[PDB]
Design a protein around this motif. Structure first.
Motif, PDB file in Angstrom:
ATOM      1  N   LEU A   4       0.967  -1.212   0.173  1.00 34.98           N
ATOM      2  CA  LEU A   4       0.058   0.109   0.248  1.00 34.98           C
ATOM      3  C   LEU A   4       0.715   0.800   0.364  1.00 34.98           C
ATOM      4  N   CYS A   5       0.912   1.762  -1.289  1.00 33.62           N
ATOM      5  CA  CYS A   5       1.587   3.106  -0.912  1.00 33.62           C
ATOM      6  C   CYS A   5       1.584   4.242  -1.336  1.00 33.62           C
ATOM      7  N   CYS A   6       2.026   4.987  -0.854  1.00 37.26           N
ATOM      8  CA  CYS A   6       0.945   6.757  -0.464  1.00 37.26           C
ATOM      9  C   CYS A   6       0.816   7.042  -2.791  1.00 37.26           C
ATOM     10  N   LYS A   7      -0.794   7.059  -1.684  1.00 36.68           N
ATOM     11  CA  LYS A   7      -1.288   7.960  -3.423  1.00 36.68           C
ATOM     12  C   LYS A   7       0.235   9.282  -4.147  1.00 36.68           C
ATOM     13  N   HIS A  30     -14.146   0.117   6.426  1.00 37.43           N
ATOM     14  CA  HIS A  30     -14.451   2.050   7.270  1.00 37.43           C
ATOM     15  C   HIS A  30     -13.816   2.655   6.038  1.00 37.43           C
ATOM     16  N   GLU A  31     -13.599   3.848   7.116  1.00 37.90           N
ATOM     17  CA  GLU A  31     -12.572   5.049   6.227  1.00 37.90           C
ATOM     18  C   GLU A  31     -11.007   5.073   6.609  1.00 37.90           C
ATOM     19  N   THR A  32     -10.788   4.553   8.138  1.00 33.94           N
ATOM     20  CA  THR A  32      -9.385   4.115   8.370  1.00 33.94           C
ATOM     21  C   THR A  32      -9.464   2.528   8.226  1.00 33.94           C
ATOM     22  N   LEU A  33      -7.385   2.619   8.256  1.00 35.01           N
ATOM     23  CA  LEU A  33      -7.675   1.492   7.976  1.00 35.01           C
ATOM     24  C   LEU A  33      -5.261   1.228   8.945  1.00 35.01           C
ATOM     25  N   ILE A  71      -0.913  10.973   5.292  1.00 34.26           N
ATOM     26  CA  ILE A  71      -1.541   9.818   4.803  1.00 34.26           C
ATOM     27  C   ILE A  71      -2.172   9.555   6.797  1.00 34.26           C
ATOM     28  N   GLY A  72      -2.242   9.549   7.250  1.00 28.05           N
ATOM     29  CA  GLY A  72      -2.824   9.808   8.713  1.00 28.05           C
ATOM     30  C   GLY A  72      -1.759   9.423  10.293  1.00 28.05           C
ATOM     31  N   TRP A  73      -1.353   8.956  10.675  1.00 24.27           N
ATOM     32  CA  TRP A  73      -1.474   9.367  12.336  1.00 24.27           C
ATOM     33  C   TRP A  73      -1.246   7.923  12.967  1.00 24.27           C
ATOM     34  N   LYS A  74       0.160   8.489  13.779  1.00 22.09           N
ATOM     35  CA  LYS A  74       0.902   7.331  15.003  1.00 22.09           C
ATOM     36  C   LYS A  74       0.246   7.178  16.044  1.00 22.09           C
ATOM     37  N   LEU A  90      -4.470   4.796   8.832  1.00 24.64           N
ATOM     38  CA  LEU A  90      -4.167   5.585   8.214  1.00 24.64           C
ATOM     39  C   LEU A  90      -5.728   5.863   6.749  1.00 24.64           C
ATOM     40  N   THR A  91      -5.280   6.800   6.320  1.00 21.13           N
ATOM     41  CA  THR A  91      -6.410   7.439   5.236  1.00 21.13           C
ATOM     42  C   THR A  91      -6.439   6.458   4.414  1.00 21.13           C
ATOM     43  N   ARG A  92      -7.293   5.702   4.209  1.00 21.51           N
ATOM     44  CA  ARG A  92      -7.942   4.913   3.015  1.00 21.51           C
ATOM     45  C   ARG A  92      -7.582   5.682   1.844  1.00 21.51           C
ATOM     46  N   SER A  93      -7.958   6.692   1.475  1.00 20.98           N
ATOM     47  CA  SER A  93      -8.092   7.436   0.606  1.00 20.98           C
ATOM     48  C   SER A  93      -7.127   8.025   0.151  1.00 20.98           C
ATOM     49  N   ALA A  94      -5.889   8.164   0.744  1.00 19.18           N
ATOM     50  CA  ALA A  94      -4.604   8.699   1.147  1.00 19.18           C
ATOM     51  C   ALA A  94      -3.247   7.402   0.303  1.00 19.18           C
ATOM     52  N   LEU A  95      -4.334   6.675   0.206  1.00 16.94           N
ATOM     53  CA  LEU A  95      -3.468   4.864  -0.516  1.00 16.94           C
ATOM     54  C   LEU A  95      -3.291   4.262  -1.574  1.00 16.94           C
TER      55      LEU A  95
END
Ligand SMILES: O=C1CC[C@H](N2C(=O)c3ccccc3C2=O)C(=O)N1
Ligand SMILES: [Zn+2]
Length: 97
Positions: A4-7, A30-33, A71-74, A90-95
């Motif tokens: 899964l790579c940075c979109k 859902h929306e958060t992976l 892309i998301g958060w730790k 991780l924001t799914r749509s950013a991948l």
């Protein structure tokens, strides 16, 4: 292929499908992976608990080290008795894919 790579820049693997797990509850409780492990993310600033989507965890902004896409958060546990002590949301749509 499990990758899964940075979109935005498509240079960086951020995580794999192998790392995916679910903190969501499967019964009447859902929306958060969420993944155990990720790579190639730079953390910005310091952990915060404000508005945390996962009560008990603080968040730190995580962006792609190459193009700075958000892309998301730790997420880091506020108590020692929790598992995991750390994961990535991780924001799914950013991948990609
Ligand atoms: O666990 C999380 C990650 C951070 C996230 N967050 C945001 O996405 C956001 C945007 C604008 C103002 C404030 C926030 C906020 O706390 C959020 O609300 N909770
Ligand atoms: Zn990128």
């Amino acid at each position: 292929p499990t990758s899964l790579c940075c979109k935005q820049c498509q240079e960086t693997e951020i995580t794999t499908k192998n790392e995916i797990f679910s903190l969501s509850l499967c019964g009447p409780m859902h929306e958060t992976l969420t993944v155990y492990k990720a790579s190639n993310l730079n953390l910005i600033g310091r952990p915060s608990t404000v508005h945390s989507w996962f009560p008990g965890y603080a968040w730190t902004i995580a962006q792609c080290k190459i193009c700075a896409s958000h892309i998301g958060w730790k997420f880091t546990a506020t108590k020692k008795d929790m598992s995991p002590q750390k994961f990535w949301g991780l924001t799914r749509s950013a991948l990609l894919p």
